[PDB]
Design a protein around this ligand. Structure first.
Ligand SMILES: C[C@@]12CC[C@@H]3C(=C1CC[C@H](OS(N)(=O)=O)C2)CC[C@@H]1CC(=O)C[C@]13C
Ligand SMILES: [Zn+2]
Length: 258
């Protein structure tokens, strides 16, 4: 009876195995655009993905993960609100059963069809497992998806999903360029928070881009054909793999833009 997104093991249940679920800096949150303070001291985000080396894509029974070789200082996030350099280790998405839901962060209570997370770890802690034990261990870049025009840079991802339909399936996924998933503007909101899945560790500097990317209805329909279950188990579509907004508590959301 492991965690998931269903009636009996979904987010309202997680606190039993992961009591930090009711903690002081949980994610995601609603971004109230009128209350977010413009912070002129915030730097432009530095997204250096020219040398990114993807290796593999994986269905872990909750999402699909595109994994990167983080053995060298290649694909790095720095600047913005961050001190030092954070290395890209994987990206994944959260999405809905319908276009009206699927994002984890909300903007003035607006839900997007999906949300892309690019997960980076702080090089001062040497690896991902040690970083998640530190309050400044991770930087997650969050990008909203809306349904409209296709995102050509997403299609290589959509086309491999047939090969990883069920939990535990993986595929070689080399030479994928995550620059093709970025919107034009790097204007962002930032706040201190957590992983949005168990173990829900309070180790994340969230950086959420204001500008969504557009993906086609056909692209997001192929996300919704994935399965939470393993090969040869009853079919449960992988949809609504999002945690709802959590209480902001004693936190300030800062805006990089006026
Ligand atoms: C980074 C992710 C997915 C890749 C995965 C882990 C998480 C932890 C939860 C994060 O979700 S969220 N929504 O908070 O960004 C995403 C847990 C540890 C795994 C070990 C491994 O082989 C792959 C790793 C790193
Ligand atoms: Zn995520």
């Amino acid at each position: 009876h492991h965690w998931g997104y269903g009636k009996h093991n979904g987010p309202e249940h997680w606190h039993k195995d992961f009591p930090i679920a009711k903690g002081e800096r949980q994610s995601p949150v609603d971004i109230d655009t009128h209350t977010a303070k413009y912070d002129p001291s915030l730097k432009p985000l530095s997204v250096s993905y020219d040398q990114a080396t993807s290796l593999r894509i994986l269905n872990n029974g909750h999402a699909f993960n595109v994994e990167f070789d983080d053995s060298q200082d290649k694909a790095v996030l720095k600047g913005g609100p961050l001190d030092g350099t954070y290395r890209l280790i994987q990206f994944h998405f959260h999405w809905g059963s319908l276009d009206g839901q699927g994002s984890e962060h909300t903007v003035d209570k607006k839900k997007y069809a999906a949300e892309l997370h690019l997960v980076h770890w702080n090089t001062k802690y040497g690896d991902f497992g040690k970083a998640v034990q530190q309050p400044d261990g991770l930087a997650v870049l969050g990008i909203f998806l809306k349904v409209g025009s296709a995102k050509p840079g997403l299609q290589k991802v959509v086309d491999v999903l047939d090969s990883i339909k069920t939990k535990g399936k993986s595929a070689d996924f080399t030479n994928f360029d995550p620059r093709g998933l970025l919107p034009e503007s790097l204007d962002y909101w930032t706040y201190p928070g957590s992983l949005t899945t168990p173990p829900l560790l309070e180790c994340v500097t969230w950086i959420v881009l204001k500008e969504p990317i557009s993906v086609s209805s056909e692209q997001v329909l192929k996300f919704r054909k994935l399965n939470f279950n393993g090969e040869g188990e009853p079919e449960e579509l992988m949809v609504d793999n999002w945690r709802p907004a959590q209480p902001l508590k004693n936190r300030q959301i800062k805006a990089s833009f006026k």
